[PDB]
């Protein structure tokens, strides 16, 4: 296994194969510079007012996050293939700013899926329990604490010791590149030994039958109405389909998004006039 | 293993032991006749307007369900012990009326947990994935299709064939008795060979890290404010605690019920005056 950096236009099949073999990869130019700047602009004061800062609530705080980032075609292409065959639908798990102040120490090496009790029942050949997209806002370098990964460690059995620090491979990214982190990949933020902060931000998704880290039930109705149907489902506003007519997150026997009136209906002609 | 019928005042420890050994049991007088009648009164028109009827949405349709039944001390005593050590919090999964018209045929024998993909990873010695309380509204008899169980079948390995029909043990209940059905117990409704309908209703609960069959996000704010804090958590209005400060269903980094203003605050003295 190896850390691969692939162009945006790499076929989805090839990315899935790299994930299976190596457990992680970087997609270059995952976001353009416009999206990097709009996200920075929308979150920068929230981060400063928040040596590690990880504020979440990103769909509430960032219109670009809820209207654009969560529709990202690479996220959905990967998630449909990782979760679809086994579970059906998937939805958003959590997502935060990943901000390292100058002087921050190395983060403990971990698997993101450790907080699922069912990770103890899972085998390394089973689908992952969650998947994270870690997108660079600043450059990620060795010296500023860019995330480090241990390619192949997603295949280790449960209870395997963490990789040694010397086994960790730093991920070198320009603003807008993204690191893909299945829940089984061992990884960690590095130490920021520079005088400038290192910042990225994440999305993550997991099967529809697992409860997200973050609810979005507190978001204003008006924000929910500006989301696409897909993002409404990602953020907990729609009923979820398993397989063969099995649904969870139902309003009684019907769909939540019908019961809440979230789905658009046509006005009566008289009301329009 | 045997089907046991126990009095309401049976110690919780003894009920948990019976569940472990036999996989099911009946608690007599689980509800009093007042609660049976109030639930019937609140749902009867909804059932008739709905040879098997299983309408859900019970917290919306029944004040007694959301204000009284979901606070039932036996449900919480069992669920805390079944789910607490492994997962921390639990919450409501689904609950419907269980109505058999005269002439209905025997229901396929099943385990309730089959729709969880992770039931394939679980072992019979692991905690159940869900637990159901099936409460009699009418009497449950052999002839009217009272639920049947196969004591001990919760310990069978995954992929074991269903019990034979001749192995099924009918559950004979008076109005207000309750049958306890862990997700691993094989069971089914029987045929209603009488001229009168047979009706019960259910609650069910499962670990906080799994997505409920039913959302309650469509319920009016005013109904949510009349629930106890416990029932608010049961029905998806509160952040959920795993272990060692891990939470899911958070509003950002804080609690959902704070972000929505669901938790009562004291008015300003001037506003009160
Ligand atoms: O910030 C980083 O580079 C990596 N962070 C994490 O893996 C995390 O917080 O789970
Ligand atoms: O209605 C009954 O007696 C039993 N019903 C079920 O087990 C069910 O619908 O899952
Ligand atoms: Fe991580
Ligand atoms: Fe059942």
Residue numbers in the entry:
A (entry chain C), B (entry chain C): 4 to 53, 60 to 282
From the manuscript:
Here, we report the biochemical and structural characterizations of the unusually promiscuous and catalytically versatile Fe/αKG oxygenase SptF, involved in the biosynthesis of fungal meroterpenoid emervaridones. The in vitro analysis revealed that SptF catalyzes several continuous oxidation reactions, including hydroxylation, desaturation, epoxidation, and skeletal rearrangement. Fe/αKG oxygenases utilize αKG as a co-substrate and Fe(II) as a cofactor. Through the oxidative decarboxylation of αKG, a reactive Fe(IV)-oxo intermediate is generated to activate a selective aliphatic C–H bond, which is normally difficult to cleave due to high bond-dissociation energy, and then oxidative products are generated following radical recombination.
To further investigate the importance of the flexible lid-like loop region, with a length of 19 amino acid residues, we tested truncated loops. Based on the sequence comparison as well as the structures of SptF in complex with 1, loop-truncated variants of 6 residues (His61-Val66), 9 residues (Lys58-Val66), 16 residues (Asn54-Lys69), and 19 residues (Trp53-Lys71) were constructed. Since the Δ19 variant was expressed in inclusion bodies, the Δ6, Δ9, and Δ16 variants were tested for their enzyme reaction activities with 1, 2, and 3. Interestingly, although the activities of the truncated variants were dramatically decreased as compared to the wild-type, all the loop-truncated variants still consumed 60–94% and 17–77% of 1 and 2 over 24 h, respectively, and generated many minor products, including the E-ring-opened product 32, but not 3–5. On the other hand, these variants also showed 26–56% activities toward 3 and generated small amounts of 4 and 5, as well as other minor compounds. Although we could not determine the structures of the minor products due to low yields, these results suggested that the lid-like region is not essential for the reactions with 1–3, but important for the reaction efficiency and product selectivity. We also tested the activities of the truncated variants with unnatural substrates, including the fungal meroterpenoids 10 and 13, and steroids 21, 24, and 28. As a result, all the variants still maintained 24–40% and 56–84% activities toward 10 and 13, but dramatically decreased activities toward 21, 24, and 28 (<20%). The kinetics analysis of the loop-truncation variant Δ9 revealed that the variants also maintained comparable activity toward 15 to that of wild-type. Thus, the mutagenesis and kinetic assay results strongly suggest that the malleability of the lid-like loop region contributes to the remarkable substrate promiscuity and catalytic versatility of SptF.
